[PDB]
C-alpha cells in the first residue's frame, strides 16, 4: 500500500510465481487472489 | 359506402400463423375450477381460452423440460362464453366448450345442529 | 389520508370536468363518452369517424390548443367485438395541461391517418400497423418499422406466442442464416400469481 | 500529485487555471471504506396503538374514474382546460450567457 | 312468494327465509372472509373473522350463523367490519408461526392471503409464540400442529361427512389441541380430503411434501378413472 | 460422505450418477465432474443435541437477525428430539 | 344487412383486378430479383413458388381481407425492390434447411405423438 | 449505436434520409406483460441505457400513480438527486459522442472519468455501476451508505472546471463553431407539431421544462434556470445541454444541503417489502414478504400516462392495469422515437457529413427508440 | 426562471472588430484549446495496473452467485422457492424433496448465468439468506456450457468465498 | 419595435392590431355561417368578441399581450389563423349534429 498514490493505485499485489500447479512468473490473473485480500484489494474494507 | 356483405369472418390468412397449427390445435373454453386448497371464488369469474397440450422432453444437458410448440403458456380471458366462441371462430381453431358450474345454493341452519330428534345433532362442536 | 397516502387535487379534477363537458358540448357528432380519473386525468371517448375533426379541434381551438401529440398507441382487448383501441395523448403548453382521446376498430376496419393533424402520428401509426395489424389510411408510407424483413403476424396481439413461431440460426451447408419454428431448450415457465379473495372491492362488478 | 514546481507553473499557465486546488484525481479527502453501523429510523406507521391499516389504505381510496356525460344517458360562458401558463422570468442570477 | 328483502350495500336482494347473512352477500357477488365456515359442513361459528355491521345495529353479527331479517342493511365494507377483521387476524396471526417458507401451503394459503387482503401489515405482539407437539395419524397426511388455527373442519369432516368420530379437541383455552389424544391413525377411504378443507398447513400431503409451489403447477381438468364414480 | 460409484464416478450429495450404460457420461471424459465435498447430512448430524429445562425452546440459527426466522419448538415428546426447521438443530429435555 | 366499411374495394371484381395487377408486378420483378441478389435458383422455380404464395390464398372470400392481403404483397414487393432484404429474407420462402414432414397416419405414429 | 439509413444524394446534398429502425428491438413491451411489476422495473433500466434511474423514476412515479401512495420526503430528495446525477452522465454521454463523431475525441475521455466516478456512486448505493434498479415504485431499495453524501460533495465541488474544460475545447472553437452552427434548423412550430421534446424544443426558443411546469418528485422545492436558445441549432442544443449540466451542478448542491432525515419506501407492507428483522421476527412481515416476492401487489385497474422531463427529452409511460399484479399494458414513449422521426426534415438541404452532426445533436439512444 | 445561451451582440466599434480580425487571421481561440491540451498532457494520468491494481469497490456489489451454510455446516437453502419465483429471467431451476432425515432441501438448483441479469432480487427475497450474489465478477469462460451451474458449483462457489461473503454481509445487513 | 421575438420561425408583426382586427372579422364572418344553436358557434363568437374588444381597447402593445393572456402577439396572431383554418375545416365537417352512432354494448368496460 501506499496512501500518497492517488484512489485506485494507492494498493497493489505482487503476484506468485508458482500457484497451485502451474508456473505463473507471465500468466497472472485477477482469480489467484483469495477472498480475504480480494476484500481488502478492492477497497471493500480498509482492514487487511 | 358500405358493401354489405354476409359471411363469417375468417382472418386466418391475415394472422402469420403457421398452417399446421391451425387446423390442428384443439382450444378449450372453460370457467376454470376453484383451487380446493383455498374457499376464496375470485379466480372463477372470467372465461379462459387455452391450447391442447404437446410433448414435453428432458434436456439432455441439464435436463431441463423442452418443448416444441409455441401456444404451450397461451392462455386468454374472456368476458362470456359467447365472446370466446367468436374469438375461435373468427381466427379459425377447432374448440370444446364446457359450460360454467356454479355451486348451488345450500340450507344452512346452526340450530340444526343440536336437533331433539334428527340425525343432524353435533356430537361436538 | 396521513402520510402514506397521495394528496388529492380538487381544482384540477373540477377543471378537468369543466373542460371535459366545454369539448363534449361542441362535438355531440363524435364524442361518446368523457371520463375523469381519481389521478385527475380526462379522456374522451369518442367514435372512429371522428378521428380527423376532434383531434383537429384540441389542436387548434383557442380554448384547447394542444399543439403536442406526446404519444399515439394501441391496446388490445381480444374480448371486445371491436378488438384493438387506440389512444391519443396530447399535451397543451399554453394551458399546461394533458388530454387523451380512444377510439376502437375490429382487424378489417381502417382508421383515418391523422399524419395531417401531427407530423408526429406517422412514425407512431406505422408501429401501431406492425405490432397490432391496424391499417390507417391515407398515410404516406405505411410498412414495418420494427419487426423484421418478412415477418408474419403481429407480436404485441394477444394471441400472439410470447417466443414467436420461428426462431434464426446459421447453415453452413447453405452458408446462411436460416429460420426453423422455435424449439426452446428449456420451456418459459408459467405462473398462476392471481389469487382468490378479490383485492379491491371498489372495482366489484355486478354477478349478472 | 507528486508534481515539481516547474511542472505545476507550465500546466497553470497553459491551462490558464490554477489546477492544484481542482485536482481530478482522488485522495485522501474521500471517506474511509470502512463506516460505523447504522441505525435507520423506523416508519410512521410503527406505532403500536391507533394504527389501524383501514386509516392508513392508500390503495382501498381508489376508485372508478367519474363518469361526465355518457351519450347513452343560460349563459354558459367559455372555459378552458386549466388557467393561462404564466411567462417566466429572465433569471436575475445570469440572464444572459 | 316467501322470499324477504335484505340490502346489501344499500342493494336490494330477496331471500328465502333462513338465508344467512353470508349467502345473501354471496347472492349480489361478495365472498364474506372466513376460515372455520364450510358450505358441506355444519356451521361452527368459531373463527369469527366473517363478523359484518348491520346498519343500525351496535354488535357486529356472524355473517356464517346468523339468519338475515328482513329490512336488514348489511354493510360489509363499514369501518367497524374492517377493524373487526383487522382485530381477529390479529389474533390468529398472534401465536402463528414463522413457518411460511418451510409450509406446503406457501401460495394456497387461505390464512395468508386473508391477512393481505383483510388483516393489518404489521404486529404488535411482543410475546413469545407457543409450540405443540405434532400428532401421528398415518402415512397419508403429515401433521404440523402448530400452525393449526382450531377452525374445527377437519373435525366436522371426519365426523359428519367421512363418518369417523377419531378427532376431537383436548385440553381448555388456549392450549386446546385438535387431535385423537391416543397415538392412533385416522384411515378412511375419504381420508385425504382433510388435507383440503385445512386452510393452514397443520395438515398437508404426506407423498407430495416439498416437491412444488403452487404458482409452478400448470392445472389439467380431467376424470378419474379408479373407480366407476368418474 | 462422498461414496463412488460402482463404475467409478463420485455419488454426489443428491445421490445422482449416471449408469454404467449411459451415453451422458462422455461429457466427463478428458475433464472432470462437479461435486461437493461436504454433505450437509452429515454435518449436521455431527452436532450435539442441546440440553434445555425448558418446555417450549427458540431458534433462529445464531447471529440474531443474519440466521432464519425465529420459530419455536415443543418438547413435550420424550421419545424423540425437537428439530428445528430451517437450521436442523436438536433439542432435547433433560431427561432423568 | 352486416354492413360494413369497405377499405379500397367495394365486391370481388375490384379484388380481383388487384390482386392480378398485383400479381403482374410480382412477375417482372423475379427475374431482376434473382439476378440482382445472386440467388441459386431459376426464375422459373421462382415464379412456382409465387404461384405456390398466390395460391395459398385462393379460398378467400371477402374483399376487405383480400385487398389486405394486397396490400400486405405489397408491402413485400416493396422490401424486394429496394433492397432492404437479403439474399436469406428471400431463401426464407423454399424452406432448403427443414427436413421433410411426413404426412401419412403410419410416418407420424413412428415419429411421436403429434397428429 | 446500431443504425441503418437509406438516403438518396444529389451530388453531394441529401435529397431523402430514412432512418431504418429495429435492429434492438426485443420486444419489451410484451415480455413486461408476463412479469410482476417488481419484475417489470428492471427492463427500464435497459430502455435508456445511459440515463438509468431517470427510467426508474418515471416508471416509479406511474405505478405510485396507480396504487394512489406516495414516497417519504427522503426518498423523493434521493431520487432528484440521484435524477440530476444520471442527467450529468446522460449529457457527458452526448456531448462527449457528438465531439466524438466530429472529431475532437479528447473530452471523451476526458469526461468519462468522472462518469468511471458517477458509476462508483451508483455502485456505492445499489451494487451496480450501470443498471441499479435502485429506484422502486414505493422509494428506493436500501438507504445511502454513511460516507456517500460527503464524497458526493467532494466530486460536485471540482465538475464546473472540468465543464469549463470541456468548453474551452469547443466553444469557442471556429471548426466546431463551423461543423454545429446553422445545422439542422427546426422552427418552433415545426418542433411543436413533430412532437420533439426537451433541448430539441428549448432550442428553438419553446419555454418548456417539465421540472418547472409539472414537477413531481420535490423539483418544485429546488431552484434552477431552464436555458433557452434562439437559433435552433445545433449549437444552441450544445450549448443548452451545457448549461443544463451547471444546473444540474446547482440542483445537486441544493439537494445535497437539504437532505431530510426518514424512512426510504413507504410504511405499507403491502407495497414495500418489510425489513428483514422484521420478516425474521414478526408473523405478518414474513407472510407479506412471502406474498410480496412471489405474487407481487396487485394494482387498482385504470390506466396512466405519466411523463418526466428525462435528459434526451419528455420520456412516458402509458400503464393499463386490469387489477391483478402484472400490468396489462405498457407503452414506453421515448423522445428519440419523435427526433428520429423528424431527422429526415431536420436534415434537407444539408451536406452528407451534416447528418452525423444532426443525429449527434438528436440524442439517440436506440434502445429507448426500439423497445 | 429561464436562461439566454447564444443572446449576445457583438460590438461593431473599430477595436473589436480588429479583435476579431486578429482572431480570425492569427488563430488565437487554435493556439488557447492547443494550450489546454498541452498543459492537460503535464499532469498525471488516471490509468491503474490492472490486474495488479483493482477498481474500487462496495459490499452491496453485485457479483457471481453463491449458497451458503450455516457455521453447523447444513446448508441454508430450505427449497422455498421465492428466488425462482422472483427471478425477472426466469434463471434459476429448483427441484426439491424430503432428504433421508426428513429435511426439507433441494436435489436440484440450477442458475443459467447468461439468462442472469445480476439484479440480486433472488438474495434479498431469500429469507434464510441461503443464495447470495458474491463479490467475485473474474469468472469468464471458454465455453457457454460451463456457465450453466448446477447445485454443486454454487454450493463451490460459497466454500470458495464464505469469509468475503460473511465479511461483506456484516458489513451491510444493517441497510436491510 | 421589439426585434428576435425567440421562436424560430416566428417573425415580428409589424402594426398587429390591423391584423388581429382582420383575422377576428375574418373569424365571425365564417362563423356567422354556422348554425345558431351550434355550441361552437356561440363559444368562439364569445371569445373572439372578448379578443376583439380588448385589442381595440389597448393601442399599447405590451399591455396588450398581458390582458390577452397569449403574449407575444404574433403567436396570438398564429392562434387567430388557426381558429379561422379551424372555423373553415369544422363549416365543413359540421360537427353540432347527433352521434353518429353508439358504441358496442360493453365497448369501454374496463377491466375486462
Ligand atoms: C509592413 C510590411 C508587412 C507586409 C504585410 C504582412 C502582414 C501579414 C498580416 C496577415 C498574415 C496572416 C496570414 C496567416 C494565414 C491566415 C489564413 C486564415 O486566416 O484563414 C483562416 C483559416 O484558418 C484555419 O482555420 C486553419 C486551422 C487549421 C488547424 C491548425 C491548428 C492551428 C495551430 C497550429 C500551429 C500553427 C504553427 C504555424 C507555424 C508553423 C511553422 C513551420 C480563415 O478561416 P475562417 O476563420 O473559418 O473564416 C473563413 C470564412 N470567411
Ligand atoms: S399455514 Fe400459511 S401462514 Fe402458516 S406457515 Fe404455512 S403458509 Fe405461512
Ligand atoms: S388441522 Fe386444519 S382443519 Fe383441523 S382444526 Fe386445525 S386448522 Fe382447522
Ligand atoms: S440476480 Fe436477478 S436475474 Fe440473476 S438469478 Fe437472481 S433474481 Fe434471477
Ligand atoms: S429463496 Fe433462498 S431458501 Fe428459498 S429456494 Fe431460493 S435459495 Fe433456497
Ligand atoms: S366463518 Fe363465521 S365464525 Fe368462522
Ligand atoms: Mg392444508
Ligand atoms: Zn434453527
Redesign the pocket.
Given at each position: 500500500e501506499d496512501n500518497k498514490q492517488f484512489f485506485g493505485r494507492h494498493r497493489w499485489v505482487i503476484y506468485t510465481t508458482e500457484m497451485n500447479g502451474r508456473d505463473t512468473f507471465w500468466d497472472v490473473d485477477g482469480s489467484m487472489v483469495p477472498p480475504e485480500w480480494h476484500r481488502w484489494l478492492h477497497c471493500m474494507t480498509d482492514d487487511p | 359506402q358500405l358493401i354489405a356483405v354476409d359471411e363469417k369472418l375468417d382472418i386466418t390468412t391475415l394472422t402469420g400463423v403457421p398452417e399446421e397449427h391451425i387446423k390442428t390445435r384443439k382450444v378449450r373454453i372453460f370457467v376454470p375450477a376453484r383451487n380446493n386448497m383455498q374457499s376464496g371464488v375470485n379466480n372463477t369469474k372470467k372465461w379462459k381460452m387455452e391450447f391442447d397440450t404437446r410433448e414435453r422432453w428432458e434436456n439432455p444437458l441439464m435436463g431441463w423440460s423442452s418443448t416444441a410448440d409455441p401456444l404451450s403458456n397461451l392462455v386468454l380471458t374472456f368476458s362470456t362464453k359467447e365472446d370466446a366462441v367468436a374469438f375461435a371462430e373468427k381466427n379459425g381453431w377447432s374448440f370444446d366448450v364446457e359450460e360454467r358450474k356454479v355451486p348451488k345454493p345450500k340450507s344452512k341452519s346452526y340450530g340444526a345442529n343440536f336437533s331433539w330428534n334428527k340425525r343432524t345433532r353435533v356430537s361436538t362442536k | 389520508t396521513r402520510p402514506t397516502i397521495r394528496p388529492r387535487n380538487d381544482v384540477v379534477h373540477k377543471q378537468l370536468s369543466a373542460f371535459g363537458q366545454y369539448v363534449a358540448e361542441i362535438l355531440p357528432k363524435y364524442v361518446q363518452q368523457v371520463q375523469v380519473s381519481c389521478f385527475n386525468e380526462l379522456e374522451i371517448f369518442i367514435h372512429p369517424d371522428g378521428v380527423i375533426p376532434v383531434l383537429t379541434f384540441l389542436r387548434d381551438h383557442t380554448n384547447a390548443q394542444f399543439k403536442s401529440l406526446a404519444d399515439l398507441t394501441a391496446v388490445d382487448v381480444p374480448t371486445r367485438q371491436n378488438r384493438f383501441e387506440i389512444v391519443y395523448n396530447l399535451l397543451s403548453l399554453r394551458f399546461n395541461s394533458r388530454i387523451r382521446v380512444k377510439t376502437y376498430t375490429d382487424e378489417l376496419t381502417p382508421i383515418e391517418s391523422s399524419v395531417t393533424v401531427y407530423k408526429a402520428a406517422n412514425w407512431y401509426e406505422r408501429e401501431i400497423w406492425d405490432m397490432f395489424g391496424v391499417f390507417f389510411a391515407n398515410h404516406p408510407d405505411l410498412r414495418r418499422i420494427l419487426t423484421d424483413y418478412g415477418f408474419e403476424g403481429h407480436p404485441f396481439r394477444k394471441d400472439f406466442p410470447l417466443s414467436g413461431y420461428v426462431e434464426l440460426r446459421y447453415d453452413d451447408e447453405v452458408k446462411r442464416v436460416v429460420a426453423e419454428p422455435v424449439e426452446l431448450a428449456q420451456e418459459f415457465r408459467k405462473f398462476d400469481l392471481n389469487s382468490p379473495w378479490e383485492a379491491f372491492p371498489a372495482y366489484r362488478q355486478p354477478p349478472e | 500529485a507528486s508534481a515539481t514546481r516547474v511542472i505545476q507553473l507550465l500546466r497553470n499557465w497553459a491551462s490558464g487555471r490554477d489546477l492544484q486546488a481542482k485536482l481530478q484525481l482522488r485522495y485522501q479527502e474521500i471517506s474511509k471504506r470502512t463506516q460505523p453501523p447504522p441505525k435507520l429510523p423506523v416508519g410512521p406507521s410503527h406505532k403500536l396503538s391507533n394504527n389501524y391499516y383501514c386509516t392508513r389504505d392508500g390503495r382501498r381510496e381508489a376508485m372508478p374514474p367519474s363518469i361526465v356525460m355518457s351519450s347513452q344517458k343560460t349563459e354558459k360562458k367559455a372555459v378552458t382546460p386549466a388557467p393561462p401558463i404564466k411567462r417566466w422570468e429572465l433569471s436575475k442570477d445570469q440572464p444572459y450567457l | 312468494s316467501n322470499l324477504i328483502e335484505v340490502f346489501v350495500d344499500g342493494q336490494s336482494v330477496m331471500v328465502e327465509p333462513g338465508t344467512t347473512v353470508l349467502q345473501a352477500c354471496e347472492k349480489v357477488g361478495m365472498q364474506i372472509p372466513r376460515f372455520c365456515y364450510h358450505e358441506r359442513l355444519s356451521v361452527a361459528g368459531n373463527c369469527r373473522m366473517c363478523l359484518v355491521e348491520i346498519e343500525k345495529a351496535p354488535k357486529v353479527v356472524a355473517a356464517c350463523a346468523m339468519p338475515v331479517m328482513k329490512g336488514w342493511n348489511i354493510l360489509t365494507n363499514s369501518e367497524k367490519s374492517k377493524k373487526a377483521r383487522e382485530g381477529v387476524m390479529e389474533f390468529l396471526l398472534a401465536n402463528h408461526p414463522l413457518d411460511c417458507p418451510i409450509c406446503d401451503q406457501g401460495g394456497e394459503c387461505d390464512l395468508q392471503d386473508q391477512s393481505m387482503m383483510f388483516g393489518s401489515d404489521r404486529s404488535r405482539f411482543l410475546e413469545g409464540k407457543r409450540a405443540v407437539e405434532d400428532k401421528n395419524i398415518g402415512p397419508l397426511v403429515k401433521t404440523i400442529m402448530t400452525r393449526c388455527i382450531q377452525c374445527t373442519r377437519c373435525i366436522r369432516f371426519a365426523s359428519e361427512i367421512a363418518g369417523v368420530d377419531d378427532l376431537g379437541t383436548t385440553g381448555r383455552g388456549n392450549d386446546m389441541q385438535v387431535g385423537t389424544y391416543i397415538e392412533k391413525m385416522f384411515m378412511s377411504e375419504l381420508s385425504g380430503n382433510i388435507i383440503d378443507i385445512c386452510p393452514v398447513g397443520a395438515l398437508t400431503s404426506k407423498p407430495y411434501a416439498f416437491t412444488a409451489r403452487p404458482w409452478e403447477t400448470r392445472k389439467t381438468e380431467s376424470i378419474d378413472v379408479m373407480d366407476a364414480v368418474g | 460422505g462422498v461414496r463412488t460409484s460402482p463404475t467409478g464416478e463420485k455419488v454426489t450429495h443428491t445421490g445422482q450418477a449416471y449408469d454404467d450404460g449411459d451415453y451422458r457420461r462422455v461429457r466427463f471424459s478428458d475433464r472432470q465432474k462437479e461435486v461437493n465435498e461436504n454433505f450437509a447430512i452429515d454435518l449436521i448430524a455431527e452436532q450435539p443435541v442441546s440440553e434445555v429445562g425448558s418446555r417450549v425452546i427458540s431458534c433462529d440459527g445464531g447471529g440474531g437477525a443474519l440466521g432464519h426466522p425465529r420459530v419455536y419448538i415443543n418438547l413435550d415428546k420424550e421419545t424423540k428430539t425437537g428439530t428445528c426447521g430451517y437450521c436442523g438443530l436438536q433439542f432435547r429435555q433433560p431427561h432423568h | 344487412g352486416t354492413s360494413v366499411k369497405p377499405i379500397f374495394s367495394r365486391d370481388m371484381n375490384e379484388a380481383k383486378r388487384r390482386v392480378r395487377e398485383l400479381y403482374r408486378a410480382w412477375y417482372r420483378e423475379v427475374p431482376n430479383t434473382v439476378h440482382l441478389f445472386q440467388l441459386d435458383i431459376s426464375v422459373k422455380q421462382g415464379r412456382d413458388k409465387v404461384r405456390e404464395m398466390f395460391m395459398k390464398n385462393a379460398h378467400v372470400t371477402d374483399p376487405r381481407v383480400v385487398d389486405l392481403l394486397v396490400i400486405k404483397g405489397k408491402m413485400e414487393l416493396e422490401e424486394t425492390i429496394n433492397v432492404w432484404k437479403q439474399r436469406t429474407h428471400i431463401m426464407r420462402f423454399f424452406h432448403e434447411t427443414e427436413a421433410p414432414r411426413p404426412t401419412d397416419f403410419l410416418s407420424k405414429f413412428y415419429v411421436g405423438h403429434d397428429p | 449505436g446500431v443504425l441503418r439509413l437509406v438516403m438518396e444524394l444529389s451530388g453531394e446534398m441529401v435529397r431523402k434520409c430514412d432512418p431504418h429502425i429495429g435492429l434492438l428491438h426485443r420486444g419489451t413491451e410484451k415480455l413486461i406483460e408476463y412479469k410482476t411489476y417488481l419484475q417489470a422495473l428492471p427492463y427500464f433500466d435497459r430502455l435508456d441505457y445511459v440515463s438509468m434511474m431517470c427510467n426508474e423514476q418515471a416508471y416509479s412515479l406511474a405505478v405510485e400513480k396507480l396504487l394512489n401512495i406516495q414516497p417519504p420526503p427522503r426518498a423523493q430528495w434521493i431520487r432528484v438527486l440521484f435524477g440530476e446525477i444520471t442527467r450529468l452522465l446522460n449529457h457527458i454521454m452526448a456531448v462527449t459522442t457528438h465531439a466524438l463523431d466530429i472529431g475532437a475525441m479528447t473530452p471523451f475521455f476526458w469526461m468519462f472519468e468522472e462518469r468511471e466516478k458517477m458509476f462508483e456512486f451508483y455502485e456505492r448505493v445499489s451494487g451496480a455501476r450501470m443498471h441499479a434498479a435502485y429506484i422502486r415504485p414505493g422509494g428506493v431499495h436500501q438507504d445511502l451508505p454513511l460516507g456517500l453524501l460527503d464524497d458526493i460533495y467532494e466530486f460536485s465541488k471540482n465538475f464546473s472546471f472540468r465543464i469549463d474544460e470541456l468548453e474551452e475545447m469547443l466553444t469557442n472553437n471556429?471548426?466546431w463553431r463551423?461543423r454545429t452552427v446553422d445545422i439542422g434548423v427546426v422552427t418552433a412550430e415545426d418542433a411543436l407539431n413533430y412532437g420533439f421534446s426537451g433541448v430539441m424544443l428549448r432550442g428553438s426558443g419553446i419555454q418548456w421544462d417539465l421540472r418547472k411546469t409539472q414537477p413531481y418528485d420535490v423539483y418544485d422545492q429546488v431552484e434552477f434556470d431552464v436555458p433557452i436558445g434562439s437559433r435552433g441549432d445545433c449549437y444552441d442544443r450544445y450549448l443548452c445541454r451545457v448549461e443544463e449540466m451547471r444546473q444540474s451542478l446547482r440542483i445537486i448542491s441544493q439537494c445535497l444541503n437539504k437532505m431530510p432525515p426518514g424512512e426510504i419506501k413507504v410504511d405499507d407492507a403491502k407495497v414495500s417489502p418489510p425489513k428483514r428483522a422484521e420478516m425474521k421476527t414478526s408473523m405478518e412481515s414474513l407472510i407479506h414478504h412471502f406474498k410480496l416476492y412471489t405474487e407481487g401487489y396487485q394494482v387498482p385497474p385504470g390506466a396512466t400516462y405519466t411523463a418526466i422531463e428525462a435528459p434526451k427529452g419528455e420520456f412516458g409511460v402509458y400503464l393499463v392495469s386490469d387489477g391483478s399484479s402484472r400490468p396489462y399494458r405498457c407503452k414506453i414513449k421515448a423522445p428519440g422515437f419523435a427526433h428520429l422521426a423528424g431527422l429526415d426534415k431536420m436534415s434537407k438541404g444539408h451536406m452528407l457529413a451534416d447528418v452525423v452532426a444532426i443525429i449527434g445533436t438528436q440524442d439517440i439512444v436506440f434502445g429507448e427508440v426500439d423497445r | 426562471t429561464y436562461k439566454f445561451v447564444n443572446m449576445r451582440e457583438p460590438s461593431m466599434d473599430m477595436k473589436s472588430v480588429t479583435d476579431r480580425a486578429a482572431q480570425?487571421?492569427?488563430?488565437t481561440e487554435?493556439?488557447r484549446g492547443?494550450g489546454m491540451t498541452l498543459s492537460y498532457l503535464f499532469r498525471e494520468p488516471a490509468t491503474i495496473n490492472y490486474p495488479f491494481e483493482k477498481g474500487p469497490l462496495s459490499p452491496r456489489f453485485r457479483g457471481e452467485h453463491a449458497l451458503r451454510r450455516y457455521p453447523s455446516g447444513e446448508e441454508r437453502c430450505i427449497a422455498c422457492k421465492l428466488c425462482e419465483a422472483v427471478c425477472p429471467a426466469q434463471a434459476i431451476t429448483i427441484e426439491a424433496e424430503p432428504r433421508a432425515d426428513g429435511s426439507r432441501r433441494t436435489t436440484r438448483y440450477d442458475i443459467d448465468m447468461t439468462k442472469c441479469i445480476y439484479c440480486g432480487f433472488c438474495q434479498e427475497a431469500c429469507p434464510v439468506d441461503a443464495i447470495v450474489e458474491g463479490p467475485n465478477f473474474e469468472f469468464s469462460t471458454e465455453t457457454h456450457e460451463e456457465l450453466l451451474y448446477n447445485k454443486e458449483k454454487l454450493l463451490n462457489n460459497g466454500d470458495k468465498w464464505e469469509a468475503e461473503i460473511a465479511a461483506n454481509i456484516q458489513a451491510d445487513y444493517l441497510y436491510r | 419595435l421589439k426585434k428576435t421575438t425567440g421562436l424560430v420561425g416566428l417573425a415580428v408583426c409589424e402594426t398587429p392590431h390591423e391584423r388581429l382586427k382582420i383575422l377576428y372579422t375574418k373569424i365571425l364572418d365564417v362563423l356567422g355561417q354556422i348554425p345558431k344553436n351550434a355550441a361552437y358557434r356561440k363559444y368562439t363568437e364569445q371569445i373572439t368578441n372578448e379578443k376583439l374588444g380588448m385589442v381595440k381597447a389597448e393601442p399599447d402593445v405590451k399591455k396588450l399581450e398581458e390582458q390577452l393572456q397569449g403574449g407575444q402577439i404574433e403567436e396570438v396572431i398564429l392562434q387567430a389563423e388557426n381558429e379561422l383554418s379551424l372555423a373553415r375545416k369544422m363549416l365543413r365537417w359540421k360537427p353540432w349534429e347527433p352521434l353518429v352512432e353508439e358504441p358496442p354494448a360493453n365497448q369501454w368496460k374496463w377491466p375486462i
Open positions: - | - | - | - | - | - | - | 471556429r471548426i463551423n | 480570425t487571421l492569427l488563430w487554435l493556439v492547443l | -
